[PDB]
Amino acid sequence: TTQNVVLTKYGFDIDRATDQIWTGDGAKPLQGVDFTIYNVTANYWASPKDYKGSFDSAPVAATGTTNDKGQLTQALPIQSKDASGKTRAAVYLFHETNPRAGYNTSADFWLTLPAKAAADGNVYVYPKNVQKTTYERTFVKKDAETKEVLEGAGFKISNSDGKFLKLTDKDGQSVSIGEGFIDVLANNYRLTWVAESDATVFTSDKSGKFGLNGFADNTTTYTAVETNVPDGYDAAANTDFKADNSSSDILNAPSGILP
């Protein structure tokens, strides 16, 4: 016999009971968060009063990923064996292995089954993920003579170590990135640092804007390098910046033609 444990992951800027079906009251549900569920029955029952969440050498009961609604369901046996081979009430520990971008991981928590279930026979848990402050930056490419904005200019970004920015999805895979401001938070991307040739190219949109959010801090200096220059212009100088939530303009001078 098993119970269903429904994990629901909401983000925050109370311990809710397992019998409570809580909608988050407007807080956003967090999709794409990975969990491993360890069967820690042997570890708890080796000495209950001493248990403090070790999953050392504990078998894995389950894995998965929160969905569009922040949810992850699993059917878990209400009983399982202890180290001495004796049947006990099962204990399961939840371990977040991959948070959502912009969020701290949640604390490992655990519970005994069978647990107190809500009206629908399910046991509801609600790990707290606290939002960590991240920073962003926008740039607006313009024509240095006309001061009009400029579409189609391509840029890469480098750090203090000479490594360039590549965005990936939650699992580290390549993604294809288009023009404009890139919402890393909403797409659950990651910032990685690689060789120039593997870098992600950012590109001014029809309003000249490009950039991203999802920076870890606002103290590191980064550099925007123009790598694709619109025809008829001269490269702007490299632009040092901080991820400080500001917008600033980058000027392309129209190249001069003499007779």
Author numbering: 39 to 51, 57 to 302
Show sentences the authors wrote.
As the first reported host of “non-pathogenic-derived” pili, Lactobacillus rhamnosus GG is a gut-adapted commensal lactic acid bacterium (LAB) and one of many clinically investigated probiotic strains for human use in the prevention and treatment of certain gastric ailments. As with other Gram-positive bacteria, sortase-dependent piliation in L. rhamnosus GG (called SpaCBA) is assembled from the ~30 kDa SpaA (backbone), ~20 kDa SpaB (basal), and ~90 kDa SpaC (tip-located) pilins. Two immunoglobulin (Ig)-like subdomains comprise GG-SpaA, each having the conserved residues of a canonical E-box motif and internal isopeptide bonds formed between either lysine and asparagine or lysine and aspartate residues. Our findings show that the GG-SpaA structure has certain features in common with other pathogen-derived pilin-proteins, such as the Ig-like CnaB-type folds and the presence of internal isopeptide bonds6940.
Included in these experiments was also a related third mutant, in which the aspartate that forms the isopeptide bond in the C-domain was substituted with an asparagine (i.e., D295N), the residue that is normally found in Gram-positive backbone pilins. D295N-substituted GG-SpaA crystallizes in the same space group as the full-length WT protein and the E139A and E269A mutants, though with different cell dimensions. Six molecules in the asymmetric unit were visible, where the N-domain of one molecule is facing the C-domain of an adjacent molecule as in full-length WT. The overall topology of the D295N crystal structure is similar to that of WT GG-SpaA (RMSD of 0.8 Å), with maximum structural deviations found at the AB loop. Significantly, the electron density between Lys184 and the substituted Asn295 clearly supports the formation of an isopeptide bond. Here, a protein band (~30 kDa) representing WT and D295N-mutated GG-SpaA was seen to be present throughout the 24 hours of trypsinization, although trace amounts of a smaller ~16 kDa-sized band began to be detected following 3 hours of incubation, with the levels then continuing to increase over time. The results suggest that the resistance to proteolysis apparently displayed by the WT and D295N can be correlated more with isopeptide bond in C-domain than that in the N-domain of GG-SpaA. Here, a first and second Tm for both the WT and D295N proteins was observed at around 52 and 66 °C, respectively.
